[PDB]
C-alpha cells in the first residue's frame, strides 16, 4: 500500500505521544456547543488498538456516576488537542474487553502503576 501510505502521510499526526494499550491517558476534545468550544477532559483506560494508518482507533473507557462510558477516539483525528498518560499499566493481553464487567476494585488490579 505504498501509494496509500503516500496519501496518509499528509494527514499524519506525529505530535501524539506513544503509549501502551493499557493506560489511563486523558484526551482533550473541543466541543462546538456554539459558539465557544468547551474543553472536556476524559480520563480512562484504552483497550482496542486497531491498525490501519489514519483509520487507527483506540477505545478509552470510563465509569461515570456509577455508569461506564465507551467513547472511541481515532488516533489521527484533528479534534484531539493533547494527550496525557497519567498512569502506565501492565497488561497480559492486547484486547482488555473483560475489565468493563469487573466492577470495581478488580478493574484497578489491571491498572497497576508502571
Amino acid at each position: 500500500q505504498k501509494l496509500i501510505e503516500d496519501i496518509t502521510k499528509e494527514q499524519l499526526r506525529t505530535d501524539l505521544p506513544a503509549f501502551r494499550p493499557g493506560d489511563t491517558l486523558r484526551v482533550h476534545v473541543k466541543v462546538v456547543e456554539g459558539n465557544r468550544e468547551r474543553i472536556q477532559i476524559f480520563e480512562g483506560v484504552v483497550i482496542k488498538r486497531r491498525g490501519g494508518g489514519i483509520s487507527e482507533t483506540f477505545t478509552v473507557r470510563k465509569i461515570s456516576y456509577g455508569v461506564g462510558v465507551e467513547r472511541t477516539f481515532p488516533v489521527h483525528t484533528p479534534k484531539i488537542a493533547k494527550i496525557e498518560v497519567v498512569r502506565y499499566g501492565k497488561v497480559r493481553r492486547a484486547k482488555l474487553y473483560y475489565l468493563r464487567e469487573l466492577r470495581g476494585k478488580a478493574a484497578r488490579i489491571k491498572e497497576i502503576r508502571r
Partner: protein, 122 residues
Amino acid sequence: MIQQETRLKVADNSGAREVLTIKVLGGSGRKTANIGDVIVCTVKQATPGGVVKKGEVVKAVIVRTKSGARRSDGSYISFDENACVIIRDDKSPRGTRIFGPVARELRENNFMKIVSLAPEVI
C-alpha cells in the same frame, strides 16, 4: 439499536424502576432506535414512592444505548446500560433529576432543556 420488546432501565426520578418498550413512533416504520428517538413504553416495575405506577403506558425519550452511536466526526459512544427518561405530551421530563452520563446527540435536537439537568454530557 433497540428492538421491540426490549426492557430499558429508568434513568430519572420518575419513581419508575424498569420500563419495557412498545413501539417506535418513527415512520411505519423503523424498529431500530438510537438516541433522541421517542418511544411509547410500559412501566414493568417502579419504586413505591413516585408519580409513576406499574403498568402505565407513557412515552419516553432514549438517553443511553449499549450500541455504539455514530457521529460525523467518527467518534462513537456506547454506554454500559440502556436508559430512557419518562415524558408526557410536552417534552419536559417528569424526572426531577437524571442519573448518569447523557449523550450529546440530544443537543442537536431542540431537546436542550433536558441536557441542562444532566450532571455531565459526553
